[PDB]
């Protein structure tokens, strides 16, 4: 009722963090599309509203950095409770599962691969926010906006994996 409640907290906090990542990504895409439209209206034809738009893009990136910090500490305490159970139950022990079937090392690998994917995607977003306001080739501008929108380091099947914890916690009805 202690470790299982930590799984109950961890799956719900995972789902809530994915929802706030999607809201911040929509705000960032609207600000970046306005930045590119202001740049092409500059070059086809100033620093205050361009600096203001770059500053709210920086505030969006700071919010995503805070979400990644909470992701890293959630995976770290999941690693800590799996190592605590592995130290407490000994080596040669056939452990019954906390829910019906799954052991806790599967939760550790799910959290590790989700953490790796979102950590790579945040670094690509920092490079896009570095290089967006200075470039002049419009194909590269469309490529940078497509890298913001389509998120090429976040894979689709990991959503299926998130729903596996939603059938290991029970927030969704069986």
């Amino acid at each position: 009722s202690v470790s299982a409640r930590k799984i109950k907290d961890n799956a719900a906090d995972w789902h809530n963090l994915i929802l706030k990542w999607e809201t911040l990504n929509d705000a960032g895409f609207t600000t970046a599309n306005n930045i590119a439209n202001l740049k092409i209206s500059l070059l086809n034809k100033y620093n205050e509203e361009l600096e203001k738009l770059c500053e709210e893009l920086q505030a969006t990136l700071d919010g995503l950095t805070k979400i990644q910090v909470k992701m890293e500490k959630l995976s770290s305490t999941t690693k800590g409770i799996c190592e605590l159970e592995n130290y407490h139950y000994g080596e040669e022990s056939k452990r019954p599962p906390l829910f019906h079937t799954w052991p806790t090392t599967h939760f550790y690998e799910v959290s590790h691969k989700l953490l790796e994917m979102y950590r790579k995607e945040l670094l690509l977003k920092r490079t896009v926010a570095k290089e967006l306001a200075h470039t002049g080739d419009p194909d590269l501008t469309l490529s940078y906006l497509s890298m913001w929108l389509h998120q090429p380091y976040v894979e689709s099947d990991s959503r299926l994996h998130l729903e596996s914890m939603l059938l290991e916690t029970g927030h969704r009805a069986l």
Binding site: C54, Q58, K130, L132, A133
Partner: peptide
Amino acid sequence: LYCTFYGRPYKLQVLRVKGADGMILG
């Protein structure tokens, strides 16, 4: 010193300051 030129962060390292009274540093 840290300045953000249009989103790009810059790292500046100060080597020498020469002031108004003519006294320089090392």
